[PDB]
Amino acid sequence: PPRPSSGELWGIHLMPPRILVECLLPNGMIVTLECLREATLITIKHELFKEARKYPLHQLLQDESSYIFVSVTQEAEREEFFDETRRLCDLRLFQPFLKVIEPVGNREEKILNREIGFAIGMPVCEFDMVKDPEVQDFRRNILNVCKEAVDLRDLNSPHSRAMYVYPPNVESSPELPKHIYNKLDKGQIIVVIWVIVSPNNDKQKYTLKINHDCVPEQVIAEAIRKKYQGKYILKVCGCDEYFLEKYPLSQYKYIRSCIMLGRMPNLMLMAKESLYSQLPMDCFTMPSYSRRISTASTKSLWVINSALRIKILCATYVNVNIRDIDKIYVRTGIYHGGEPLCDNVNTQRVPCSNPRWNEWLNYDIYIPDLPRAARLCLSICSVKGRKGAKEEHCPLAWGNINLFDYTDTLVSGKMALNLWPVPHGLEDLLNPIGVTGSNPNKETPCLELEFDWFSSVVKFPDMSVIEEHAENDKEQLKAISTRDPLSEITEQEKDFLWSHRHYCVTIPEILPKLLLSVKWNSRDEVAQMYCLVKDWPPIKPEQAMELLDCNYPDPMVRGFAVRCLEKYLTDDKLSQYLIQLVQVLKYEQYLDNLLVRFLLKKALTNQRIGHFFFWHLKSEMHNKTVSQRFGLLLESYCRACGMYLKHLNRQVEAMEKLINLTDILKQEKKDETQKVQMKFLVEQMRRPDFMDALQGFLSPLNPAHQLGNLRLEECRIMSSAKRPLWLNWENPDIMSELLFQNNEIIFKNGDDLRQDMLTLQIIRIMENIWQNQGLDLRMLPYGCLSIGDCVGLIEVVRNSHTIMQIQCKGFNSHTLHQWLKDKNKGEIYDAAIDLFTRSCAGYCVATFILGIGDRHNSNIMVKDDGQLFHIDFGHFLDHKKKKFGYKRERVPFVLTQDFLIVISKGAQECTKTREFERFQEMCYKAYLAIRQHANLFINLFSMMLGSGMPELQSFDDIAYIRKTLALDKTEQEALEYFMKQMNDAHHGGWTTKMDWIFHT
Amino acid sequence: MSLQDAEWYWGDISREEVNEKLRDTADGTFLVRDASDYTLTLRKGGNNKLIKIFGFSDPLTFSSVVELINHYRLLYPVSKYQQDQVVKEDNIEAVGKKLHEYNTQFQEKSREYDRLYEEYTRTSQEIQMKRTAIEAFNETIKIFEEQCQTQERYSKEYIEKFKREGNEKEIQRIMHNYDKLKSRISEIIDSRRRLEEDLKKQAAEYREIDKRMNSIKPDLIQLRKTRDQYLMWLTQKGVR
């Protein structure tokens, strides 16, 4: 199973300096050997074989070299220790014992499978066991994608290999926003080309003025001129980001950032060969499970002339207090997405103490009318009819089943289903958004079921069979297609869209609106829909993504959506939306689908995608609802990712040492002073096993960042109750001074970081809309990565302090403005105030829209240069609706006098200023820029409903941004609404230009 | 016949509020409310159908909105009445006193649910840890039993031979190690037995946390709905 803790032994986080190890000799002898906790297996084996000579039957023992050790690990796995350089403390032993064996089996497969199992947090052999044919087919069938990717990587070696390892970190378009272009001097950029001259490794500087449009070779060309053959490559100073592809220099994110910030782009020229040599040739190998044996009258669904019928037999048990509840029943529903295909049918009520129904439930659905993605969503509910004629219905356990399997076979016969716990905050009687399949925990309520038998195996019809042919409105259609995904669509508009389904092709972007106008409980309408999507024009990737959410379960619809991504979705956007693309995988009816294959292909052809793909899946391996899907997927990634597996295992080992350390402080050292805890941190971090694991690995926040040696004098436990670890590392890059010397990260074990991760993602997407629309509203979407259950990394922003930190060490309402003055004296003052105002506006708009948690002096930080940003988002949307039942849209970021004084440069009447007038205009422009991209934000939130985030469980939870963005109003009405919210929150000050026409 | 006094008209209520009202209702359950002209929402086949009131499709015979609803009456109405039966109190002071009571009860009960939910999660996690640990003991015990078997297979011939050489020290050395091996297995088996005990107790402790939670969940929903009902009553009674 998955490892209970991150300890060195079971029930022991840390082994003592010296420990007794039970050694099981091959002659039946047992030797107790006192070992050092950090001793290697070579040392232990040598000490055991020397001591074994003092015990009977030593004559039966061969050379120590003939054997290896095997033991039971914390994963209940019998692991063979082929890497004898490993230390006893890093073996993850269940108990301190070692058994001496002769190496057998395929050594290299065993070594690879253990490396895979380590990365993935689960032993590979657990998959080999699984009875389910869908699972074993997925394991074999996905190998096609693995092959494809690896072959495509050795196509143009070593460039195609370098392109995989170090892909171009570029924007989606070379088109430079006019406000970025005006920072250029006649469409030209000043770059600094550094070179590491041999043999002393002296750093040479070369300032170059070149076209922003200059391809990387053209930059090399100019550097040569300032003393033909593209035998050199460009790299960013201070990190592992290369310019290997022919993209205009300005299209590369690093360069694009340098222009906008007025920063000097510092590049490094190196030999194409010095990088190509350091790249190892990656070799995928077909696993054992692909080279082995298995598998030791048919009707169409359309010929079954009968209604739908399902028998609910009995449930093993329920956990209910009989003195508080009256009766229990089975609620069921037939669903296509989150939409019932017919009315929900309940069984009769029976007593808590005897869950037995033996009842056929008849559904108002004709078996041939069942769509391909149809599901049986069910639950066992409790009913208490205590007060009045009022009865409270509460779900106890739920379960969902696909009515057809991966092979298109209609479900038949007796079926047992282990039910799942009701997710926190879910009050609905059914969970149609939850995963399909039985609960792997068999110590749960088990519901016995029975489907109809039709004397044969029923299969869903073939696609050939399904292809059965059996002016004022042009402007109405455009108006419906502009509307947001969650806009109300009337039965009239449905009937209208359905009637005009053929003219609909002229406006392809209406496809989600049209798909929701289809009666999915009618094989007549669906057959026709299927023909339309087959010959449907492609839509934009940001529109196609909606078709991958829980509203669109149909395989043809999802298939169509995946093809839009295959052809139109840039790696920049796949990286930007990967969080959502990984989440929608949970909505997939089956393990093998077009989405999972596309994402794996991409993760295996781009290492920047591969890194986050791995971490998003690895972080949810503790969650039994998706751990089998996510596990099999991660095994196939790890099997084909090449050398990146080695670097991933170094990241995973560093993180386990951090989890264990924080677990010790949180549990054993919980009632100990900061000095006592700090002394313990200091001595532990100094240990070689610790120093080896936490030095010289890639940053899980950004794999282009090398974490060299730890600066132990800068590492500390933070005052916050979760006891976060502040960690500092040296940047080992040759030119680190040109980027950063200190790579500081906060390690947090205790809080769930998924909502912060999402809020930070949205802020980045917002910041990018604004830049592209000509608005320089500088945001700080600091790195944040969830790596497991309530555990993650947070990127430290240097030279930045909280408002409370600034307020102390100096307080009045001018303390903040005074602090900024002291840090930005003379010429650089104005820029500090401009940056504060711009950043301040972006945060004001963004937080109002998202409904982030209330701001205070401790969760608002200001950089030394004036850049204001928010930290600790935690909550979002209508998080206060259940708790207080007030129908309002809060202004989390109310600009106090302290901020107003900064914006107004210390003026008396702060709102009547031109500074505040310009700040208002920034807010208005930002608000309308997001409101225009409303569909994106609605899709991104819709694609996270299955995530398990408390504040994002239904589409009704997304309604909040429909309110703050005032989507059911006109653009002019929405701006009036924003202005009123600001005025009501700030008690006046917010004005504009014109009322009737809203023209200057 | 009459207008705003009508039980099925609800005014400014949102789609979401209607979804809450029409939740798990029977085909024909309906209500009318302001759009964004009004919107009739009709419960049919497990879904809420939104039908726009311009008359649905033109020309009309609309007369007044009430004549349209009564023409199709669209079986059961969601009445404004009986919802307003929940708040008995006459004055603003008696209602505010009762809202403060319910809101205080709700916040306590919420904090109790949160505390109970954390113990549910912890117990559920701990149970999963012990299950993995028993699997590890099961695999460990098997290896130690294999050592006995392996010692038994070898020594059988050596002890038989050692008696021919009169070496009583060597036979005592062999069986001293077999005693060490057996005592260790008894120590491992006993340690698994005790873990099996804690798990049986914690599995029982989980059933009871689940039981307690299935009891507060319905009482927390009801109490919140009352808090919210008194809150709505106090907004409408107070100045607008």
Ligand SMILES: C[C@@H]1CCN(C(=O)Nc2nc3c(s2)-c2nc(C(C)(C)C)ncc2CC3)[C@@H]1C(N)=O
């Ligand atoms: C004197 C130095 C200067 C820099 N610095 C910081 O603390 N920089 C930081 N950058 C961040 C921080 S802290 C952060 N913290 C938290 C927690 C809520 C978990 C605490 N969440 C998120 C973030 C992200 C950004 C020191 C200071 N100001 O005392």
